[PDB]
Coordinates of C-alpha atoms and ligand atoms in Angstrom, one line a residue:
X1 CA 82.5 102.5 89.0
X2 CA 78.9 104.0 89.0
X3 CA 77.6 104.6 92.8
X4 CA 74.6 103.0 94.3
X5 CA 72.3 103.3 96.5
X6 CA 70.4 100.1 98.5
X7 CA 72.8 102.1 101.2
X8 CA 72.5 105.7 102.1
X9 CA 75.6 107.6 102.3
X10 CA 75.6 110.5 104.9
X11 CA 79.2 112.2 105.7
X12 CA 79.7 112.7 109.3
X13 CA 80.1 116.2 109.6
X14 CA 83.5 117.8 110.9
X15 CA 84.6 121.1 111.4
X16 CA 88.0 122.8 110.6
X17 CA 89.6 126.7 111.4
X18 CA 91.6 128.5 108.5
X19 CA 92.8 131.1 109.9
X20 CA 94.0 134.4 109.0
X21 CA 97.4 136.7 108.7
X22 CA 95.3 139.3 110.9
X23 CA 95.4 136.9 113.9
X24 CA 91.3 135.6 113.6
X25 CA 89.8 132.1 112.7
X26 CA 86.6 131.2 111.2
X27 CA 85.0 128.1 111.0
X28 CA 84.7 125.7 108.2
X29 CA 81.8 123.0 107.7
X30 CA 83.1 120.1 105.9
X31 CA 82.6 116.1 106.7
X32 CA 84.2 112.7 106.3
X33 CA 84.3 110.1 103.3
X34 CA 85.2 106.6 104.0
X35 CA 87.5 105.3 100.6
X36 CA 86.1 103.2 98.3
X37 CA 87.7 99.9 99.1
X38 CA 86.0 99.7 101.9
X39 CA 82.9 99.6 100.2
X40 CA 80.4 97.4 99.1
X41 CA 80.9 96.8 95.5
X42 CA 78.1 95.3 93.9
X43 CA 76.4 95.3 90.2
X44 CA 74.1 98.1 89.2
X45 CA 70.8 96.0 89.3
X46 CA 71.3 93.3 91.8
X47 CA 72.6 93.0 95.0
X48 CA 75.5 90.4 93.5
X49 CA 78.6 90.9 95.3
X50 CA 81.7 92.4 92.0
X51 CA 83.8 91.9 94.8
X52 CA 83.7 89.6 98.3
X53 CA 86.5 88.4 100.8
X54 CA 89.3 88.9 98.6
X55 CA 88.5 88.0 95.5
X56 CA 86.1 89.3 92.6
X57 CA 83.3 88.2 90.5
X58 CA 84.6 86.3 87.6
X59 CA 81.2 86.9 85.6
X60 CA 80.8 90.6 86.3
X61 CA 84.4 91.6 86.5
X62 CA 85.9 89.6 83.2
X63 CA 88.3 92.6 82.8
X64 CA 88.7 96.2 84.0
X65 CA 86.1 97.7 81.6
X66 CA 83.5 95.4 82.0
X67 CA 84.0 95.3 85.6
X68 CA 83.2 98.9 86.1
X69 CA 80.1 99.2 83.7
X70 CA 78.9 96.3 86.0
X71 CA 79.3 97.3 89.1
X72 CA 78.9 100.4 92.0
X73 CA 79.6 101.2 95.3
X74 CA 77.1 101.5 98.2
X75 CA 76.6 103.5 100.9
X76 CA 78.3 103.1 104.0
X77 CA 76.8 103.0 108.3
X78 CA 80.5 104.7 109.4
X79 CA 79.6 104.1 112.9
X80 CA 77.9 100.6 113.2
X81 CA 80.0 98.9 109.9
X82 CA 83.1 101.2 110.0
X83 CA 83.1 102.8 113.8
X84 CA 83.6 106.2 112.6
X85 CA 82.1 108.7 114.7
X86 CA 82.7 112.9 114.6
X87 CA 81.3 115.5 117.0
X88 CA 82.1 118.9 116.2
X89 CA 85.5 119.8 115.0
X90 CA 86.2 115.4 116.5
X91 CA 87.0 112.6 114.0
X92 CA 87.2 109.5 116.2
X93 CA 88.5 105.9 114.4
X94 CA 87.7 102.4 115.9
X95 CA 90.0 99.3 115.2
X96 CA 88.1 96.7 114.9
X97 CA 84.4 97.0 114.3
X98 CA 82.0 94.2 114.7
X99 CA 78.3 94.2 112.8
X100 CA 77.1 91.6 110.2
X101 CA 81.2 91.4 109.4
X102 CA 84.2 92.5 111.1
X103 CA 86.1 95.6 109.8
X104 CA 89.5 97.0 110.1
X105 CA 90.0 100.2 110.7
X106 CA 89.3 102.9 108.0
X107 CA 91.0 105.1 105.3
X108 CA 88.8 109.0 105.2
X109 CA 89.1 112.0 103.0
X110 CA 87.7 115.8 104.4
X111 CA 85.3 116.9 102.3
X112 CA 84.3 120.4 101.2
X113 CA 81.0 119.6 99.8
X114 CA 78.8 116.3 99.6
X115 CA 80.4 115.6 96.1
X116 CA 84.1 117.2 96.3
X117 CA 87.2 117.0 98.6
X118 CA 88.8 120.3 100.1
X119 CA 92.2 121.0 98.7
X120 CA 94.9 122.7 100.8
X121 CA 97.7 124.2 99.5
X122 CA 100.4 123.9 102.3
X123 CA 103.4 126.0 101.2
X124 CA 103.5 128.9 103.1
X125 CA 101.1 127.7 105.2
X126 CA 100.8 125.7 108.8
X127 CA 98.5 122.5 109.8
X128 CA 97.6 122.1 113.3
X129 CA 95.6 119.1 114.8
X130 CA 95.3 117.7 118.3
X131 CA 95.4 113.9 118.1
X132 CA 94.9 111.2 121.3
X133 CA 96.6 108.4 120.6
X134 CA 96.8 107.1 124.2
X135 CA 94.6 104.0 122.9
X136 CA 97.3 103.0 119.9
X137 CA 100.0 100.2 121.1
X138 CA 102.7 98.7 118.8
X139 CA 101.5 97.7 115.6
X140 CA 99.1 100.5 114.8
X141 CA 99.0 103.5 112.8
X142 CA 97.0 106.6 113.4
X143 CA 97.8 108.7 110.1
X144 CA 97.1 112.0 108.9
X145 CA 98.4 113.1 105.9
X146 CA 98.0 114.9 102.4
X147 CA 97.7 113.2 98.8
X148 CA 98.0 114.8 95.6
X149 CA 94.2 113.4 94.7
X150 CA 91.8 115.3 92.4
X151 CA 89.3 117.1 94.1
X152 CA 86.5 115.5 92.1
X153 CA 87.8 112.0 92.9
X154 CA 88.6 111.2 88.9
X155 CA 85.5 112.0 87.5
X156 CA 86.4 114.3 84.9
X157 CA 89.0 112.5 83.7
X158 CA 87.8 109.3 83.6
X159 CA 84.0 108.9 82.5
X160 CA 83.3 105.5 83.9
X161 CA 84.0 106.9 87.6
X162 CA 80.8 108.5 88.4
X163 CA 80.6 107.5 92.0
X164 CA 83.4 109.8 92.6
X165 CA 84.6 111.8 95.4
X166 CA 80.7 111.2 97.3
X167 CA 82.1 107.3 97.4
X168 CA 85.7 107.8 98.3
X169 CA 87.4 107.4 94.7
X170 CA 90.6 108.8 93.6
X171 CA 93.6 107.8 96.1
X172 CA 96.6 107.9 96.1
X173 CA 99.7 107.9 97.2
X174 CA 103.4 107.2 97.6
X175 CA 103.4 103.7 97.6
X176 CA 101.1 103.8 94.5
X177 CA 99.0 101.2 95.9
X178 CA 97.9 98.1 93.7
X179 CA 94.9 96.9 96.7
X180 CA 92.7 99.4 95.2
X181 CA 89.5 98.0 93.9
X182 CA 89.1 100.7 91.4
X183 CA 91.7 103.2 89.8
X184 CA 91.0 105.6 86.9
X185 CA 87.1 104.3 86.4
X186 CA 88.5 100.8 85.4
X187 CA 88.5 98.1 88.1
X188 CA 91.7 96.5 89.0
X189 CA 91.0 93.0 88.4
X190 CA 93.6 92.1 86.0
X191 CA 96.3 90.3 87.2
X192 CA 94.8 90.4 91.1
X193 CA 96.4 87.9 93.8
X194 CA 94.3 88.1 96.9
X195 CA 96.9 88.2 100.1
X196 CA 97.8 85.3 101.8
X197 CA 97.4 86.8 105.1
X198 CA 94.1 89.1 104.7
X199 CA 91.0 87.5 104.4
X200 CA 89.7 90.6 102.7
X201 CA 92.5 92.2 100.4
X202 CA 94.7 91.3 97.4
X203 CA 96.9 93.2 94.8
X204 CA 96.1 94.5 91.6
X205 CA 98.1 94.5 87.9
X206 CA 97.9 98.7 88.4
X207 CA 98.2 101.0 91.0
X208 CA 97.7 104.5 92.0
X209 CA 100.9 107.1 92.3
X210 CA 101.1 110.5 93.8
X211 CA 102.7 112.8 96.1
X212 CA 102.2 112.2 99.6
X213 CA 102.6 114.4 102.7
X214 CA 102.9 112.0 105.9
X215 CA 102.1 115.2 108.5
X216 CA 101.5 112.5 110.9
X217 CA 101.8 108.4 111.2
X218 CA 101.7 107.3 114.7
X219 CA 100.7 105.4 117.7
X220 CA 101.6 105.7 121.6
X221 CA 105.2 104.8 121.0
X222 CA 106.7 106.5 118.5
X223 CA 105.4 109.3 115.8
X224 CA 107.1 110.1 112.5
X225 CA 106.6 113.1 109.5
X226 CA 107.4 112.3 106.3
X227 CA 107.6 114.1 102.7
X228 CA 107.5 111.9 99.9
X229 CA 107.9 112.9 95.8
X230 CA 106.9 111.8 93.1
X231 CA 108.1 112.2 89.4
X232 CA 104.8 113.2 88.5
X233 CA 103.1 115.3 91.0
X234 CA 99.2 114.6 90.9
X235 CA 97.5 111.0 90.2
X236 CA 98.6 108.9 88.1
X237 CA 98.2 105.1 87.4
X238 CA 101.1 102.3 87.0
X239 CA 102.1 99.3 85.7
X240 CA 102.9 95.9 87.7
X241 CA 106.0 96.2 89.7
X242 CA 106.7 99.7 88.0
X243 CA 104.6 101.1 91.3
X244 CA 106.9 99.9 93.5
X245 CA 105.5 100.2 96.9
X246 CA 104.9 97.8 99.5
X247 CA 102.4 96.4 97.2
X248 CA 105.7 95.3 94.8
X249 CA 108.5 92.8 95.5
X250 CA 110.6 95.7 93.9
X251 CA 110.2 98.6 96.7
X252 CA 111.4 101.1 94.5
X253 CA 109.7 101.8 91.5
X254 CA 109.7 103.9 88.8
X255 CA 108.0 107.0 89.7
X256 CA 107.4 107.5 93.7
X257 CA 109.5 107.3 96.6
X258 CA 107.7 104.9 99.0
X259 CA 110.0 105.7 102.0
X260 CA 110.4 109.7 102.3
X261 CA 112.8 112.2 103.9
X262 CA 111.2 110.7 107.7
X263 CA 111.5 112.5 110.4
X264 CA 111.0 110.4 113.7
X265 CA 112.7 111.5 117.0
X266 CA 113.1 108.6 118.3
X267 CA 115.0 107.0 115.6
X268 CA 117.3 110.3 115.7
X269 CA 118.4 109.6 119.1
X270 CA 115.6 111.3 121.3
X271 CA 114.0 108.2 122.8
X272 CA 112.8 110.4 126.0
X273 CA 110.8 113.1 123.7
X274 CA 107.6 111.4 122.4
X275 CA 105.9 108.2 124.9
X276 CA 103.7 107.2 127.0
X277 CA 103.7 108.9 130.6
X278 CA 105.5 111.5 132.9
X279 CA 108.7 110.5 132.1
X280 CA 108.5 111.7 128.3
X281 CA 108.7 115.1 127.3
X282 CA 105.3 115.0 125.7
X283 CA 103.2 111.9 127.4
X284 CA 101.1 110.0 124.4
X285 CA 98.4 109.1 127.4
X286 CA 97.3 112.5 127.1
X287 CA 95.9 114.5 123.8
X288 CA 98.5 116.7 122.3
X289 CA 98.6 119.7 119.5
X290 CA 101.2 119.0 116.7
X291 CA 101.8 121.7 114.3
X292 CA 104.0 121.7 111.1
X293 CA 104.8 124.7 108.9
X294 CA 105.7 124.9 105.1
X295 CA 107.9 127.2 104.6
X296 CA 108.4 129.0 101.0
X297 CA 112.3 127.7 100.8
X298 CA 110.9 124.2 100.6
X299 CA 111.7 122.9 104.4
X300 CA 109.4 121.7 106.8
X301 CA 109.4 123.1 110.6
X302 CA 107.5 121.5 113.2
X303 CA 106.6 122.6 116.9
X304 CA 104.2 120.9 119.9
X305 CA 102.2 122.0 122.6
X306 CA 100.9 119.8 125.6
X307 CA 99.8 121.5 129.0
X308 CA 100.1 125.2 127.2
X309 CA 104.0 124.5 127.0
X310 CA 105.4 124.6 123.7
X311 CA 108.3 122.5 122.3
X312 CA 110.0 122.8 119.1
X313 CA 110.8 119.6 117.2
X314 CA 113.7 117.9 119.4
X315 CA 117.1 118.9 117.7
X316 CA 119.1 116.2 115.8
X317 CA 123.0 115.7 114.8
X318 CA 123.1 113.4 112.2
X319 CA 126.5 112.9 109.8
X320 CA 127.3 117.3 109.0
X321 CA 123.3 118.1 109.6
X322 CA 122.1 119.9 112.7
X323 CA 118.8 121.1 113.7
X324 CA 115.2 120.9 114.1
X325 CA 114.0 122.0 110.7
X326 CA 113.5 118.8 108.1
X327 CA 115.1 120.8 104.7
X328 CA 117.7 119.5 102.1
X329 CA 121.0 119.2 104.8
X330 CA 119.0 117.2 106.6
X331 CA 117.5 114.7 104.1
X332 CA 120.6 114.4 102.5
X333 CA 122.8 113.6 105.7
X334 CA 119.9 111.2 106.5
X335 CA 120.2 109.5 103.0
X336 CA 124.0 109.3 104.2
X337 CA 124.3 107.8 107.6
X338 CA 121.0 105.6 106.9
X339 CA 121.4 104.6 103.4
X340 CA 119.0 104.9 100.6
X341 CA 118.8 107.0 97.7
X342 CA 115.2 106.9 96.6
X343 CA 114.0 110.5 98.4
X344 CA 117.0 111.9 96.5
X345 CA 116.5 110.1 93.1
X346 CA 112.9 111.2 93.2
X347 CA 114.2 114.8 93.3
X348 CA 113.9 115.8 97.4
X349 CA 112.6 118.2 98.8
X350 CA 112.7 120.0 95.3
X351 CA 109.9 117.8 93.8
X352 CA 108.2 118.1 97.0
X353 CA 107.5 121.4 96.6
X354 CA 106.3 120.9 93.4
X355 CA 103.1 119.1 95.5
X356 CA 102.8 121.8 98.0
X357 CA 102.4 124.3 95.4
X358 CA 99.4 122.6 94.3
X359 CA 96.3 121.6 96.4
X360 CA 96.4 118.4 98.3
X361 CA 93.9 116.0 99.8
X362 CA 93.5 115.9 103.6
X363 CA 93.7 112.1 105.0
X364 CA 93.0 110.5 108.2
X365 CA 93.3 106.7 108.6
X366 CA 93.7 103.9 111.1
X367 CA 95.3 101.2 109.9
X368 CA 97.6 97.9 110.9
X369 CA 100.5 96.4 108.9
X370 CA 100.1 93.2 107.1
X371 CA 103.4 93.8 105.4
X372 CA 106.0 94.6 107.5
X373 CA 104.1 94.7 111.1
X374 CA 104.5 98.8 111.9
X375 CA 107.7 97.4 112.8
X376 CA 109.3 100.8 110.3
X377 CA 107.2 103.0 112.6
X378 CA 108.0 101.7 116.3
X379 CA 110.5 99.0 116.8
X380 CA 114.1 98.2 115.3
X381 CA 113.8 97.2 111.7
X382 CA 114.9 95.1 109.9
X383 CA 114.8 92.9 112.9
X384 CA 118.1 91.4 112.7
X385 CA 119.8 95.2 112.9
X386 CA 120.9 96.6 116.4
X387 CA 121.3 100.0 118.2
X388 CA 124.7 100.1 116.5
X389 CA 123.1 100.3 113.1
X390 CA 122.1 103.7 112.2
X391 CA 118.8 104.4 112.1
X392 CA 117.7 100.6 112.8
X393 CA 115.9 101.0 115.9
X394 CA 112.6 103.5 115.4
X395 CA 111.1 102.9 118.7
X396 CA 110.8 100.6 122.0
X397 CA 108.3 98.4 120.6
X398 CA 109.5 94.7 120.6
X399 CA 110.5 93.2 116.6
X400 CA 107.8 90.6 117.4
X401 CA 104.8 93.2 117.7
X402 CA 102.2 94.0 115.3
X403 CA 101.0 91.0 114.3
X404 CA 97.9 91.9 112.6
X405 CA 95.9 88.8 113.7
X406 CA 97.2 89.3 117.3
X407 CA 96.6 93.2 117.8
X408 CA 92.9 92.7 116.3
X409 CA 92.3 89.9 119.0
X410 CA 94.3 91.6 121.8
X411 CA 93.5 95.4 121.1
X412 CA 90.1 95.4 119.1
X413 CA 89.0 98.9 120.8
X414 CA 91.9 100.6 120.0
X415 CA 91.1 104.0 118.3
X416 CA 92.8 107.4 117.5
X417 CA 90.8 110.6 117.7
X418 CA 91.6 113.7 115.7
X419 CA 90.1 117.5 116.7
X420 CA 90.9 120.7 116.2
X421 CA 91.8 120.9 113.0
X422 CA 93.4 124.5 112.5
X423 CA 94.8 126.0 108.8
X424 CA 96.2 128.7 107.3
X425 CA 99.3 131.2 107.2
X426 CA 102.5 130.6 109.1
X427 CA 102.1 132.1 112.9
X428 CA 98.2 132.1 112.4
X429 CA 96.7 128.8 113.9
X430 CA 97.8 129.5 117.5
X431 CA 95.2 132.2 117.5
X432 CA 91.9 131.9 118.8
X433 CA 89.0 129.7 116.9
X434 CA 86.0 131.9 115.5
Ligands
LIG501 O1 114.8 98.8 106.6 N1 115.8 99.1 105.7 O2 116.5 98.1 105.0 C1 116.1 100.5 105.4 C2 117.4 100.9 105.1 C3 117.7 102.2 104.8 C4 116.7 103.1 104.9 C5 115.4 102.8 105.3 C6 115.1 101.5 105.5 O3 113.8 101.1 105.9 C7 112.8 101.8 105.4 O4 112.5 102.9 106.3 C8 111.6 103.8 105.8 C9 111.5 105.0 106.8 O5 111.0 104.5 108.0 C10 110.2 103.1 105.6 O6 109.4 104.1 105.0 C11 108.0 104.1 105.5 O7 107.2 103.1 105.0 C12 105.9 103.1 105.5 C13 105.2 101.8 105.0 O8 105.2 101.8 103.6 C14 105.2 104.4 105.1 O9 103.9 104.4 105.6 C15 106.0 105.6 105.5 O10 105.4 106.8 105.1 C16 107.4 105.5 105.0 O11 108.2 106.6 105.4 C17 110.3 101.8 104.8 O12 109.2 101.0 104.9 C18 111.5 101.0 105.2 O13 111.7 99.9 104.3
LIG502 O1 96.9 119.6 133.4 N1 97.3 120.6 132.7 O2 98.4 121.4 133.1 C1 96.7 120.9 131.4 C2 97.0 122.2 130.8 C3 96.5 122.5 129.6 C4 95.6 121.6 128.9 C5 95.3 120.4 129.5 C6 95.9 120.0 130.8 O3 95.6 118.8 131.4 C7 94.8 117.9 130.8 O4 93.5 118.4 130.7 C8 92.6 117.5 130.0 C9 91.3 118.1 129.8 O5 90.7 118.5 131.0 C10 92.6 116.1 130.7 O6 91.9 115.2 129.9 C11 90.6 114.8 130.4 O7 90.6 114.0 131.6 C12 89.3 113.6 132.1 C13 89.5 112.9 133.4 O8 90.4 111.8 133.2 C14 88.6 112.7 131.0 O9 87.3 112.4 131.5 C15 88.5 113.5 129.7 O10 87.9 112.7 128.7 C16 89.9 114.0 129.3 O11 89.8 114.7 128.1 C17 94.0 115.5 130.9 O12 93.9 114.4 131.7 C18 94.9 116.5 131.5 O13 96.2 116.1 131.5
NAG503 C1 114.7 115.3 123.7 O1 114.1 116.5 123.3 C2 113.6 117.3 124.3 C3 112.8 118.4 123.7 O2 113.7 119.1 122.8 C4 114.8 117.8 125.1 O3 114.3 118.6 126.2 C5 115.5 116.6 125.7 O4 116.7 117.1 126.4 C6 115.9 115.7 124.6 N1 116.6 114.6 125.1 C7 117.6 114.0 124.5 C8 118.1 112.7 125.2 O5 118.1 114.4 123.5
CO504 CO1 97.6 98.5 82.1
CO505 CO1 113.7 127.9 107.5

């Protein structure tokens, strides 16, 4: 798609920290982009919708080609159309946002310029944010996370992408997602079936693998952190059902794994660690710093602070496994006592590594389940399973929560905020901000 411009687009700024070995920060100036699905989508020289509710233009978008010489994205109002709002080094998400239309919730990249995304590369390296999530109940999803995306959001490898990373192109990710609009400067019109259950979404014939790096997918209730491989590191497009995804009747595909090595306390046995009030080690009704570390070797450590008082990633016993560090014993043991093969069969933590070498993407999103309800995330699942089945019951939430419809009507000012974004060498983001 080409970009347009009947809508201004101005990033909200956002600052960031990368830190140093030698114990000093120094700011960063970057900003937010909202991702092109949530765009207008309109042709070149009218203001004919390619795209609207969940369905596309049969006249402009005949095919995939024709559909993205036709047709650009806008601009997009982040605050009044998308209720996305920074101040500072602050990146706050609204729910539901009410202007001409109603919007859910929002999918942003951090950029490094006006026209490109900023690439970390996390091995050997630590991420730290502070995140409020006192305002997400059951059924939401306050994510922040790293994709293997190009930094220019496709354009040089795909010519009829010139909106690029300035309108949000390019994702990503584990699931390789067939709801995007646009993948590899073709539309994704072919073979699209709106959903039955979203007034303003459907699924593609294609979608849009890479690695994925869940640091963080959370609400009030339960929080989990999740590697995910891929066979092929970076982006890269597929077929129908090969995604897999949630987006596939087939989960498991042919090139991701859509379900990672997870790591959620609560679902390890620790349901007094991470929830809401005094009574839980760290209390989700107040702002806490999460930190996690990338370690050469290929395993993933983790600490948090609240109050100034620091805790380490609660240790689990799971089948041989014991610890607080997420490396190959413990995916392994979890592949074991939960079932599932597809972290392993995707090469573990091994392929992992492969992405962290690299430069990834940085991700923030809010975001409610019309698939499966969050139910993975925060309540027992699948919803006939008990306490007695390992790894069944991921949080307190009830099996009949999440209900997109009902959290929109119930919870419409929900919101997560993220701040403080720190980076850089192991040891080196506890240090003071420059
Ligand atoms: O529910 N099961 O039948 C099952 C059995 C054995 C292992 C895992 C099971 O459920 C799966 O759990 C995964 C870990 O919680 C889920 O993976 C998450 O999926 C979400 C939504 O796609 C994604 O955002 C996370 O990053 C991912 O870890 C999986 O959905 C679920 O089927
Ligand atoms: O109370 N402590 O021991 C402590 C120690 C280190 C950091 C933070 C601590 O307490 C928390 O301090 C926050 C910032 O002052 C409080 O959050 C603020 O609360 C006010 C009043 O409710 C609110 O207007 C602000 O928007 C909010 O950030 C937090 O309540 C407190 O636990
Ligand atoms: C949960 O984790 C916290 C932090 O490590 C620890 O203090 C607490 O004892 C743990 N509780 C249980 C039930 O494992
Ligand atoms: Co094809
Ligand atoms: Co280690």
């Amino acid at each position: 798609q080409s970009a347009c411009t009947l809508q201004s687009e101005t990033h909200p700024p956002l600052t960031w920290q990368k830190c140093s070995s030698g114990g000093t920060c120094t700011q960063q100036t970057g900003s937010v982009v909202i991702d092109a699905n949530w765009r207008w989508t309109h042709a070149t020289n009218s203001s004919t919708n390619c795209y609207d509710g969940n369905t596309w233009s049969s006249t402009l978008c005949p095919d995939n080609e024709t559909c993205a010489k036709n047709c650009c994205l806008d601009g997009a109002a982040y605050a009044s159309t998308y209720g996305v709002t920074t101040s500072g080094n602050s990146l706050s998400i609204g729910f539901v946002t009410q202007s001409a239309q109603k919007n859910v919730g929002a999918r942003l990249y951090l950029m490094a310029s006006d026209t490109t995304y900023q690439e970390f590369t996390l091995l050997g390296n630590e991420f730290s944010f502070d995140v409020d999530v006192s305002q997400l109940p059951c059924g939401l999803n306050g994510a922040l996370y790293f994709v293997s995306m190009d930094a220019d959001g496709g354009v040089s490898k795909y010519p009829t992408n010139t909106a690029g990373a300035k309108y949000g192109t390019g994702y990503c990710d584990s699931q390789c997602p067939r709801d995007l609009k646009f993948i590899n400067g073709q539309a994704n019109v072919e073979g699209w079936e709106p959903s039955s259950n979203n007034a303003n979404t459907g699924i593609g014939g294609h979608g849009s693998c890479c690695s994925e790096m869940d640091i963080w997918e959370a609400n009030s209730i339960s929080e989990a952190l999740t590697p995910h491989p891929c066979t092929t590191v970076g982006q890269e497009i597929c077929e129908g059902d090969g995604c897999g995804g949630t987006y596939s009747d087939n989960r498991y595909g042919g090139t991701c794994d859509p379900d990672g090595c997870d790591w959620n306390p609560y679902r390890l046995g620790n349901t007094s660690f991470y929830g809401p009030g005094s009574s839980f080690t760290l209390d989700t009704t107040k702002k806490l710093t999460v930190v996690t570390q990338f370690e050469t070797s290929g395993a993933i450590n983790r600490y948090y602070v609240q109050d100034g008082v620091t805790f380490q990633q609660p240790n689990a016993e799971l089948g041989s496994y014991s610890g607080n560090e997420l490396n190959d014993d413990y995916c392994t043991a979890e592949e074991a006592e939960f079932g599932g093969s597809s972290f392993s069969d995707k090469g573990g933590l091994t392929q992992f590594k492969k992405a962290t070498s690299g430069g990834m993407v940085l991700v923030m999103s809010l975001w409610d389940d019309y698939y499966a309800n969050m139910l993975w995330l925060d309540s027992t699942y699948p919803t006939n399973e008990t306490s007695s089945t390992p790894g069944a019951v991921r949080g307190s939430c009830s099996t009949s929560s999440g209900v997109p419809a009902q959290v929109e009507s119930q919870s419409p000012n929900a919101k997560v905020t993220f701040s403080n974004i720190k980076f850089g060498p192991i040891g080196s983001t506890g240090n003071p901000s420059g």
